[PDB]
Amino acid sequence: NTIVVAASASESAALQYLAPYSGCTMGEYFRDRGEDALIVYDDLSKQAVAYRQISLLLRRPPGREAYPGDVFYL
Amino acid sequence: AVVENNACEQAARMIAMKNATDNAGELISDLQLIYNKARQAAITQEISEIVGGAAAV
Amino acid sequence: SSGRIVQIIGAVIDVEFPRDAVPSIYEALKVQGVETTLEVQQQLGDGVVRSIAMGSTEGLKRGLNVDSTGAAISVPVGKATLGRIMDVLGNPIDEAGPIGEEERWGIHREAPSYADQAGGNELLETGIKVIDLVCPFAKGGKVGLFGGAGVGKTVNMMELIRNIAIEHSGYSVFAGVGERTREGNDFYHEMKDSNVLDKVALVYGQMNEPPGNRLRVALTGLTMAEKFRDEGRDVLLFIDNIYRYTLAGTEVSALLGRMPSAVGYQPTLAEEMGVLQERITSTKKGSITSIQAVYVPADDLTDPSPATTFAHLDATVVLSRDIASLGIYPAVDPLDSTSRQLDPLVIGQDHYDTARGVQYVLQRYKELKDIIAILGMDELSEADKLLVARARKIQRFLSQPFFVAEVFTGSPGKYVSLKDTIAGFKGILNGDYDHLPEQAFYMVGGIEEAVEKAKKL
Amino acid sequence: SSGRIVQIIGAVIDVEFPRDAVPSIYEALKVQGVETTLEVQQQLGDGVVRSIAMGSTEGLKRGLNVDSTGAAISVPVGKATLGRIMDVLGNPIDEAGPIGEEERWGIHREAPSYADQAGGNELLETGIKVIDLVCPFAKGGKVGLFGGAGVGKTVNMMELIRNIAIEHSGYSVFAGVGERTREGNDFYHEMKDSNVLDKVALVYGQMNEPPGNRLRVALTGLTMAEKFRDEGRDVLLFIDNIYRYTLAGTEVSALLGRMPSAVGYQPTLAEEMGVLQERITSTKKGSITSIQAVYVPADDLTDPSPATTFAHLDATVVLSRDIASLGIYPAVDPLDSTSRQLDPLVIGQDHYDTARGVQYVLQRYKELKDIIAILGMDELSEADKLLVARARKIQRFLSQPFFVAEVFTGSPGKYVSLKDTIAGFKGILNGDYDHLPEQAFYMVGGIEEAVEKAKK
Amino acid sequence: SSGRIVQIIGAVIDVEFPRDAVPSIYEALKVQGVETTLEVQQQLGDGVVRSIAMGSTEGLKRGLNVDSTGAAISVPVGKATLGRIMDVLGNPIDEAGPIGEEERWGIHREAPSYADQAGGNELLETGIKVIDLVCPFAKGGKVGLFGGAGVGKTVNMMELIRNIAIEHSGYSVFAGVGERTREGNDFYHEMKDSNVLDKVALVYGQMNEPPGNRLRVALTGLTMAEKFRDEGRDVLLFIDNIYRYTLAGTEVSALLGRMPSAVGYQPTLAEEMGVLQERITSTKKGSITSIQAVYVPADDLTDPSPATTFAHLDATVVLSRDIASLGIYPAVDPLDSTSRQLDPLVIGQDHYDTARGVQYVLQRYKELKDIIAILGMDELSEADKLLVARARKIQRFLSQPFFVAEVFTGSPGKYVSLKDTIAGFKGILNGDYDHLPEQAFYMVGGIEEAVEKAKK
Ligand SMILES: Nc1ncnc2c1ncn2[C@@H]1O[C@H](COP(=O)(O)OP(=O)(O)O)[C@@H](O)[C@H]1O
Ligand SMILES: Nc1ncnc2c1ncn2[C@@H]1O[C@H](COP(=O)(O)OP(=O)(O)O)[C@@H](O)[C@H]1O
Ligand SMILES: Nc1ncnc2c1ncn2[C@@H]1O[C@H](COP(=O)(O)OP(=O)(O)O)[C@@H](O)[C@H]1O
Ligand SMILES: [Mg+2]
Ligand SMILES: [Mg+2]
């Protein structure tokens, strides 16, 4: 009954940033056809660390704890 | 013997509350050193964030 | 003449125009072929303007032609906005067709003048006991509901909308700024079921929208409330999160080329706060009663964003994390919340001595709590024991069941009048209920219900 | 073809190449005169690569000719590495001749796949009472020994090497990453004197080295352990300070042109930790059991380098300066040390119930510290007084004399089996030794030695 | 050759010069047609120097011609500075005409060398009994001065000025760093009415001045004290707050765009403290001894500004409200004041035994005062009552009439030598004067004046 989506620790930070949106799209297939789905994001903090790395290496200007300003929007 | 034991009870209560006041002041001095360390670290972290934000703009 | 997009970094887009046709500051711009609007923030020189999108940047490329409208973002105003849901641009986001307005207004405006100001002192009864006791509201006044995440700002705002706006003879504007889509749908069906929706205009920009929407949606709602105020009417205005206007201004700020101020904020924090807050006020033409809930980050009232919001309000209601964590709701801290109408010439002498007596007994018990936590109850004097028992009964009697919170408590809600509140708190303060247990005053309503509950323990 | 040095700032050297001959990322380069090895990190454009030297940069000038080798840094692997000491480049540093290897492996490779992962929960007995009680180990598992400066990390690892060597018959790789040169000489002469040197391969890049050597030496030791794992063996990997890999990535980070992250760290911190830590695992071909010492800066566990290190491990042993200041060694905080093998379907219900009861008694003792400091033990209730008495006997019985700590004290070391540890802590928790004094529970092996120490 | 102003941002002015006539670091520049002086901080390249204005920049434009003086800021030195108020440039700010000096000196110079140190640990006699007994001053030493306002700081400073001028044939220089204008006018009129104005040279750098003036005003007063030291004298130098010197360094370093250090301070904090404090020494010609009042930020002694300041201080004098409420003047706490010279290798065994005996008797009286407060005088023994009587006699003998306080006390002032202080306090400590009442020991000079006071 479960799809497992994995973006582990030695993979690229882009795939670690894009894994909750991809699993959300896979969960949203069942939502759009009148069925019910449940999703776990087991670390959103590590997704924020991966997006902080991508934002610092693109030289976007940082804020509190060197996180980008759009991280709440993330 | 009962009245003299009551006076000895009040003298022991005097010694115990003086000891409780002194140990409370010892814990206050230790926590004040921890507070001054945290205040200095908070000022240093806020200045590092302001300087790193200003260097990227 | 038209410009072209030269740079897209996040929500911030740079457009190059010819040198005789540079758009002004806060001019709306239309991207050709994609349904997106840009608002000009800065003029950078050499024909280049820097702007924020009022939509998603996924379909945008460099090289796209951009037209200028010659004016600011204009939204519909009038009584055609009543009963409708609009976005930041004034387009309808229900499915009820087009808005048939007769007038459009730009969202950027001056504050009213010093000579235009008018302040009354008429009391506005709420039916919540702690709000009627320690923070009395004013008709055409400004109300803040400060508090952290989860302490009850939205439930308190829904109880004030039930106890004020349903029996209000005038019009209302609700502005959802950077909040949950589920709560926005829940409120629309609640005003639709109660036959109240025909007097209320809804303006929504949710938390998943681009930062440009969340930056201007409060200006859109205030523009419709300004048209209703300058028509001569008495207007209500509810903003569920005015902090989200600030936070979206954080999100664009260093990408606009600003160096950061303290605690990571924009350096223009107080000026952007004052430009929005100085237009909300009541004038000599009409009156606006505004209720705004203010988010407090990590329950820190000395964080700079709520500390700049504290000076703009007439009546401040501060919700405590500690009191909600003791299971007590509405969870208003009665020592940290003040009001300008807490004056003996406004509410009378009796109300003022009851409120200051409650605050004195609670401030005394705040200093006695750790002493009972270390040594125990028996080690105090007799007046301390009587004052701690009367204070715990005061802290349980400040609680109240709500009509909008019956899905959370299971128990029905109560409306308590001002005189019932003053008589009940005076009866607890005078020692007329020193024989009842402290659990009899928890979630009851009037003082008679506490007496009825004490016979069931 | 050949390039020319255009920039030297510290350990970081920019080399300009011709445009059809730009070397790849992680390619080794050689300076033509001095034979300094460089390793390419970035391609900046314009023919220019940005690299990190594997050695000293004093004496180098702009304009020197640099050759490219065409491949990465390759170290000797196999049977010939055993008994030998090598540096980061694979050169021998033990004055014993060349290494007679048959193959060399590059030090950069990918992690093994998800389908190649191996599960297992077979218990590894360590002989240390607190480690076997509250955070037990597994074969093919991963161990962190967290702790601040001078709290014991190396003493515990030397005891874990000595007791894990009893029931293990395969090979071992020991990697010194940024620690004391005197500790490397002592461990080599100890293994050479007791004739276990021919099973252990030694790699050392210590505190005296330039930060490229400290940045890349753990990859060399892991490459040798990966060759032993991919021959189908069961191997032990010991790394003294993995924190010192990370700090070497601090020292070159601003010289590589990066904007700093929080508290001055590199922005690629979790990715460098993940790319190193995901190669350490057991696979279906063979198994690696790994013990790593992990430094905690300024005794702060919420510093980002240990806080990123915590989720890469199966068992976590946290040491404390307060417990060592009470005189208790091996100084393990039992309320901060966890492992995934503490689970009733792995170790049984009895051992799990004894460990949960010990942690309950120590947590309720930790909650009474300020009220015991202000008013004393006399104003507690009677069950609270009994629990403080049993808690001090548990805290004294968690200490143990070590075989490697025989030089510090003169008391002989003890090996305690798991059954005696479960029976002794169960007998303390049940009330069987409420008549014993608490100082009889200090620095003994079994509960029977506490019984003989009580009659003295 | 002259230059032109190219940039005005606040008090920071950039001036462009021709390439063969770039002026030196710390050179004084003059704007043509205006009364504005600039001090060069940095050389930026292409002839452009970055400088700090020593006044208001309102009304300055780009394009103004700027002349170079060829040297640093040069102040008048010698006997003509005595009795006069001056600013940081040495211009008079009293309305009393020009200073008639014979010599001008620049304010930047090195510390005296290793071979120019005088040697030994020679004491400076102040004539005050509590200072020469409990916290003795060294020649070339540094004195931290603590306490608030209204407890007699200014009266102690005028008495030190009068004592070093009359009894030791030396001079004094006051440097007010961050001087409030109301208190400087008050201090000037108090020194006219106490006849000590002609013994001290006054330099003020006021609070409403830009922070380079408040940075260089102590160097101006130290230059005048160096000329007085090089005439063969023993000089006192008073610094009104050293924390405002540190904060003016923070402000000047923030205006130049330097990256700030820990807790907000300048990264050159210890160096800018050391350039000022290493010039205050004892040399082979004469000595300068400094008295500097210290503010502590947030009551934190481990803050970087008092931690850098306390590394240079040789003594501390703590002023107390509770001693001044008892009528005892000067209000120096004998238990809280410390000295590095209070050491039996420095001052001998006899002075050390008398001072530690006085400090033990006052500490035992301090705890017995709480005993008398908790349970009454009947709890104490005969030896405790004898120590209370001797301690009240010691506590009243620490008071002394001053020559600058004869309006206040209504008595003639006294100068007490160190020999008479050690002999008098030894005579109280040995029980030689137990037959005298305690009120004879109040406000006299030596112990013989207390003996003739107890006949009246
Ligand atoms: N008056 C109340 N009675 C009962 N539960 C309440 C009350 N107010 C809040 N709560 C509980 O706390 C939650 C958070 O309240 P909410 O108004 O959503 O907080 P906020 O808007 O401040 O984030 C509610 O959903 C409910 O579970
Ligand atoms: N088990 C032990 N018994 C006695 N002393 C110990 C023990 N463990 C550590 N110590 C003491 O602590 C010191 C530091 O230990 P070490 O392992 O070098 O610490 P770390 O690796 O954390 O820097 C030892 O040299 C010794 O003095
Ligand atoms: N030596 C002294 N004898 C008598 N009274 C003194 C003496 N020194 C100070 N006082 C009293 O203390 C008060 C404060 O002195 P002052 O030096 O002016 O402190 P501040 O300069 O901080 O105001 C004076 O008004 C004076 O009455
Ligand atoms: Mg809410
Ligand atoms: Mg070690």
Helical (H) or strand (E) element with C287: strand C287-295
Alpha-carbon gap, residue E98 to E102, rounded angstroms: 12
Rounded-to-integer distance, Cα C263 and Cα C302, Å: 11
Distance CA C253, CA C245 (A): 13
Q: Is D152 in the pocket of ligand 2 (CB under 6 A)?
A: yes
Sign, Cα dihedral of E347, E352, E353, E358: positive
Say how far apart CA A9 and CA A13 lie, in whole Å. 9
Q: Which residues contact E25 (CB under 8 A, 6 or more apart)?
A: E40, E41, E42, E43
d(CA C417, CA C435): 25
Q: How was this structure determined?
A: cryo-EM
Q: Residues before each break in chain D (C–N > 2.5 Å)?
A: none
C76 upstream amide cis, omega within 30 of 0: no
Q: Of the candidates C80, C15, C1, which has an alpha carbon nearest to the alpha carbon of residue C51? A: C15
The candidate with the shortest Cα–Cα distance to C142, out of C307, C278, C269, C323, is C278
User: Closest Cα partner for C55 from C215, C254, C220?
Assistant: C215
Ligand located closest to E401 CA = 3
Q: What are the structure tokens assigned to E324, written together? A: 């001044």
Half-sphere exposure in the Cβ direction for E329 (13 Å, CA) = 20
CA-based torsion, D28, D29, D34, D36: positive or negative: negative
Bond preceding residue E330 cis, omega within 30 of 0: yes
User: Which of E30, E79, E109, E180 is an active site residue?
Assistant: E180
How far, CA to CA in Å, does E230 sit from each of D308, D416, E170, E286?
63, 78, 12, 7
Cα pseudo-dihedral C227, C228, C232, C236, rounded to 10: -140
Q: Choose among E352, E434, E438, E337: nearest CA to E397.
A: E438
Chain A residues whose CB is inside 8 A of the D259 CB are 56-57, 59, 62, 66
Joined together, the tokens standing for residue D336 give: 């901060």
Compute the distance between CA of residue E101 and CA of residue E105 in angstroms, rounded to an integer: 11
Residue matched to tokens 């620049």: E106
Give CA–CA dist C19/C45, Å, rounded: 9
C269 in A contact zone (CB under 8 Å): no
Element (H, E) at C204: strand C200-206
d(CA A29, CA A24) in angstroms, rounded, equals 9
CB atoms within 10 A of CB E292: 25
User: Between β-strands D338-339 and D315-318, what pairing exists: parallel, antiparallel or unpaired?
Assistant: antiparallel
Tell me the sheet residues that pair with E12.
Answer: E9, E52
Calculate how far, in angstroms, residue C152's C-alpha sits from the geometric centre of ligand 4.
7
Q: Do C262 and B56 touch (CB under 8 A)?
A: no
First to last CA, chain E: 79
| D267 reaches A (C-beta below 8 A) | yes
Distance in angstroms between the alpha carbons of the first and the last residue of chain A: 28
| Protein residues with CB under 6 Å of any ligand 3 atom | E 149-150, 152-155, 329-330, 402, 405, 408-409
Q: Determine which of C250, C265, C269, C305 to mutate to test the interface with A (most A C-beta atoms within 10 Å).
A: C250
C-alpha–C-alpha distance, residues E201 and E171, integer Å? 8
Burial class (CB in 10 A: 0-12, 13-18, 19+), D100: exposed
Q: How far apart are CA C320 and CA C331, in angstroms?
A: 6
| Euclidean distance between CA atoms C285 and C296, whole angstroms | 34
SS (H, E, C) chain E: CCEEEEEEECCEEEEECCCCCCCCCCCEEEECCCCCEEEEEEEEECCEEEEEECCCCCCCCCCCEEEECCCCCEEEECHHHCCCEECCCCCECCCCCCCCCCEEEECCCCCCCCCCECCCCCEECCCCHHHHHCCCEECCCEEEEECCCCCCHHHHHHHHHHHHHHCCCCCEEEEEEEECHHHHHHHHHHHHHCCCHHHEEEEEEECCCCHHHHHHHHHHHHHHHHHHHHCCCEEEEEECCHHHHHHHHHHHHHHCCCCCCHHHCCCCHHHHHHHHHCCCCEECCCEEEEEEECCCHHHCCCCHHHHHHCCCCCEEEEECHHHHHCCCCCCECCCCCEECCCCHHHHCHHHHHHHHHHHHHHHHHHHHHHHHHHHCHHHCCHHHHHHHHHHHHHHHHCCCCCHHHHHHHCCCCCCCCHHHHHHHHHHHHCCCCCCCCHHHCCCCCCHHHHHHHCCC
Q: Within its chain, how far is the Cα of C299 from the centroid?
A: 16
| Torsion angle of C-alpha atoms E70, E74, E78, E81, degrees rounded to 10 | 150
Q: What is the Cα–Cα distance from D321 to D315, expressed in whole angstroms?
A: 20
Which tokens hold the place of D56? Answer: 């000293």
Is A56 close to D277, i.e. CB distance below 8 A? no
Q: Show which of residues 183-212 on chain C sit within 8 Å of chain A, judged by CB atoms.
A: 211
* 3-state SS, one letter per residue, for C7-74: EEECCEEEEECCCCCCCCCCCEEEECCCCCEEEEEEEEECCEEEEEECCCCCCCCCCCEEEECCCCCE
CB contact under 8 A, A60 and C9: yes
Q: Which residues are paired to E298 by β-bridges?
A: none
Rounded (5°) CA angle C137-C138-C141: 105
Task: Using a CB cutoff of 5 Å, list residues around ligand 4, an ion.
Answer: C 154
Which tokens is E407 given?
Answer: 């309006």
Q: Residues near C200 by Cβ (< 8 Å), separated by ≥ 6?
A: C82, C83, C165, C171, C172, C173, C174, C191
Contact B32, A42 (CB under 8 A): no
β-pairing, E28-31 with E65-68? antiparallel
> Tokens in use for E345?
């290798």
Half-sphere exposure of C42 (CA within 13 A, CB side): 13
Q: Are E32 and E205 in contact (CB under 8 A)?
A: no
Catalytic residue set of C = 153, 179-180
* Cis preceding linkage at D211, omega within 30: no
Beta pairing, strands E234-239 & E200-206: unpaired
- CB C327 less than 6 A from any atom of ligand 1: no
Q: Are C354 and C362 in contact (CB under 8 A)?
A: no
Is the distance from CB of C1 to CB of C21 less than 8 angstroms?
Answer: yes
HEC secondary structure over chain D: CCEEEEEEECCEEEEECCCCCCCCCCCEEEECCCCCEEEEEEEEECCEEEEEECCCCCCCCCCCEEEECCCCCEEEECHHHCCCEECCCCCECCCCCCCCCCEEEECCCCCCCCCCECCCCCEECCCCHHHHHHCCEECCCEEEEEECCCCCHHHHHHHHHHHHCCCCCCCEEEEEECCCHHHHHHHHHHHHHCCCHHHEEEEEECCCCCHHHHHHHHHHHHHHHHHHHHCCCEEEEEEEECHHHHHHHHHCCCCCCCCCCHHHCCCCHHHHHHHHHCCCCCECCCEEEEEEEEECHHHCCCCHHHHHHHHHCCEEEEECHHHHHCCCCCCECCCCCEECCCCHHHHCHHHHHHHHHHHHHHHHHHCCHHHHHHCCCCCCCHHHHHHHHHHHHHHHHCCCCCCCCHHHHCCCCCCCCHHHHHHHHHHHHHCCCCCCCHHHHCCCCCHHHHHHHHCC
- Separation of alpha carbons E264 and B48, rounded Å: 10
Distance CA D192, CA D194 (A): 6
Amino acid at C201: A
Judge whether E129 counts as a catalytic residue: no
Please tell me the distance from the alpha carbon of residue A7 to that of residue A9, in angstroms, as a whole number. 7
Q: Please give the resolution of this entry in Å, rounded to 1 decimal.
A: 2.0
C-alpha dihedral, C353 to C359 to C360 to C363, nearest 10°: 180
Q: Is B49 within 8 Å of A62 when comparing Cβ atoms?
A: yes
Residue E249 Cα distances to C397, E57, E313, angstroms = 58, 20, 19
Closest to C220 (Cα-Cα) out of C91, C61, C376, C70: C91
Residue C124 Cα distances to C131, C188, C418, angstroms: 11, 25, 10
Could you give the CA distance from residue D212 to residue D248 in angstroms, rounded to a whole number? 7
Q: Measured between alpha carbons, how far is D58 from E31 in angstroms, rounded to an integer?
A: 47
The CA distance from C69 to C26, in Å, is 11
E153 is catalytic: yes
CA distances from C375 to D372, D373, D380 (A): 12, 14, 11
Q: Are C20 and C55 in contact (CB under 8 A)?
A: no
Distance D79 CA to ligand 5 centre (A): 29
Give the other-Cβ count within 10 Å of D1's Cβ.
10
Chain C adjacent subunits, 3+ CB pairs under 8 A: A, B, D
Task: Specify whether the CB–CB gap between A8 and D279 falls below 8 A.
Answer: no
Q: Indicate which residue's Cα is closest to atom 10 of ligand 3.
A: E152
**Interaxial angle between packed helices D418-430 and D349-366, expressed in degrees from 0 to 180 and rounded to the nearest 10:** 50
Judge whether D147 is annotated as a binding position.
yes
* Contact predicate E449/E415, CB 8 Å: no
Task: Return the CA Rg of chain E.
Answer: 25
3-class DSSP state of A27: helix
Is the separation of the CB atoms in E444 and E129 below 8 Å? no
Rounded CA-CA distance C10/D98 in Å is 57
Chain D partners within 8 Å of B56 (Cβ): 259
Q: Tell me the nearest-neighbour CA distance from E210 into chain B, angstroms.
A: 24
Q: How open is the CA angle C204-C210-C213, to the nearest 5 degrees?
A: 40
Three-state SS letters, E358-411: HHHHHHHHHHHHHHHHHHCHHHCCHHHHHHHHHHHHHHHHCCCCCHHHHHHHCC
Tell me which of D30, D109, D139, D180 is the catalytic residue: D180
Token pair recorded at residue E272:
């800018």
Question: How many CB atoms within 10 Å of residue C22?
Answer: 20
Pairing mode, strands E3-9 and E12-16: antiparallel
DSSP characters over C242-275: THHHHHHHHHTTTTTT----GGG--TTHHHHHHH
Q: Which residue, E453, E448, E401, is CA-closest to E428?
A: E448
Checking B22-29 for CB contacts under 8 A at 24+ apart, the result is: B23/D373, B23/D374, B24/D374, B27/D370, B27/D373, B27/D374
D251 neighbors D11 (Cβ within 8 angstroms): yes
